[PDB]
């Protein structure tokens, strides 16, 4: 149907067996994001 995958596509062993992958755009890795907690912590005011 098409010839070029112009999209963000990581390269690994399985895919490289059937299609060559030219050269990398840029180098990245895998990380984890978590929602920040209590933007204003210790909300307990005076008179405590």
């Amino acid at each position: 149907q098409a010839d070029m995958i112009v999209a963000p596509l990581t390269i690994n062993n399985e895919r490289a067996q059937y299609i060559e992958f030219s050269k990398p755009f840029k180098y990245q890795g895998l990380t984890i994001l978590v929602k920040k907690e209590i933007p204003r912590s210790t909300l307990d005011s005076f008179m405590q």
């Binding site: 390269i11 690994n12 062993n13 490289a16 067996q17 990398p24 840029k26 180098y27």
Partner: protein
């Protein structure tokens, strides 16, 4: 100094008190990797690429680098004032 990025990072995160620091906290300017040069058209290229790719999915060089490319410092009293910011207090009186 201007040299290879990987070599310079190893020196910088190694000295006494990690005083020596790269500009802008480690900014690179031409992301080109390393490699293994082979003869032109040589047939060993196809399967040697797969072997290197396989190790990346098995976490080999991720822990291997820790055996040779680990730094010593972390790129983060003195009860003295000596004007410091108290000039603003005098600047108010100015």
């Amino acid at each position: 100094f201007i040299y290879d990025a990987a070599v310079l990072n190893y020196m910088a995160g190694r000295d006494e008190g990690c005083k020596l620091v790269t500009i802008g906290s480690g900014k690179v300017f031409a992301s080109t990797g390393y490699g293994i040069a082979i003869q032109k058209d040589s047939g060993w290229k196809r399967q040697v690429d797969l072997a290197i790719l396989q190790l990346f999915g098995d976490g080999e060089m991720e822990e291997l680098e820790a055996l040779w490319l680990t730094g010593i410092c972390h790129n983060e009293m003195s009860s003295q004032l000596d004007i410091d910011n108290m000039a603003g207090v005098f600047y108010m009186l100015g």
